[PDB]
């Protein structure tokens, strides 16, 4: 220790360090573009979703709330937004 770039830490250090503890607070979450096999509509779902979000066209609930990230419905296809 005794010398660091608190302005320029290694990106690995930032990734492992807790959020609100980095040089600038940066959320670890993101959004998801999710395709339900029911209808071809693509919906945006927050990673740590909270409500049992269903498709607007049909009752095909996509993400399930829990302590951590919303657990998906085993059938839908997701990409990171």
């Amino acid at each position: 220790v005794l010398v660091q770039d608190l302005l320029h830490p290694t990106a690995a250090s930032e990734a492992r360090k807790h959020k609100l503890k980095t040089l600038v607070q940066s959320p670890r979450s993101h959004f998801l573009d999710v395709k339900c096999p029911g209808c071809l509509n693509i919906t945006t779902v927050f990673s740590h979703a909270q409500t049992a979000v269903t498709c607007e066209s049909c009752s095909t609930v996509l993400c399930t709330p829990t302590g951590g990230k919303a657990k998906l419905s085993e059938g839908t296809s997701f990409r990171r937004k």
Binding site: K19, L20, V24, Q25, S26, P27, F31, T44, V45, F46, A49, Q50, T51, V53, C63, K81
Partner: protein, 151 residues
């Protein structure tokens, strides 16, 4: 890490990012956002669950970010802000729930203690709100006015 009425010292919170404008990938615009928010307002939902629904059901990061304005202020502009603010109303609901629990069974001395803490929180919050004059200066909660104010 104060945690008003508990020895707890955590920091479970949410850290909104550096950016203040909307994200580039956001295909929506302010107008549809405000119409949707106000539609939920007619649906009879408090601003908190409106925010969380817009965060999950849609790409709404934060209402201020994409609309330029804050949900309470938007509702006030459209005149659907509850006459009792969210947090005090929910504290009142919790207080009346605990009061019902205490009346239906007596010896819960520990539950009586936490009812006292709930009343203390209500008092402080109401004092702040009356300093900002959100609530009329005569407003006072003692036992049973809230028993109708919940309904």
């Amino acid at each position: 890490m104060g945690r008003m009425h508990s020895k707890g010292k955590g920091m479970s919170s949410s850290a909104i990012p550096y950016s203040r404008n909307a994200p580039a990938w956001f295909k929506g615009s302010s107008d549809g956002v405000v119409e949707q928010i106000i539609k939920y307002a007619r649906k009879g939902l408090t601003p908190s669950q409106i925010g969380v629904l817009l965060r999950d059901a849609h790409g709404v990061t934060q209402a201020k970010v994409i609309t330029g304005n804050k949900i309470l202020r938007i509702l006030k502009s459209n005149g659907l802000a509850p006459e009792i603010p969210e947090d005090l109303y929910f504290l009142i609901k919790k207080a009346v729930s605990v009061r019902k629990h205490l009346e239906r069974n007596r010896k819960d001395k520990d539950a009586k203690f936490r009812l006292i803490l709930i009343e203390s929180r209500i008092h402080r919050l109401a004092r702040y709100y009356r300093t900002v004059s959100v609530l009329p200066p005569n407003w006072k909660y003692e036992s049973a006015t809230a028993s109708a104010l919940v309904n």
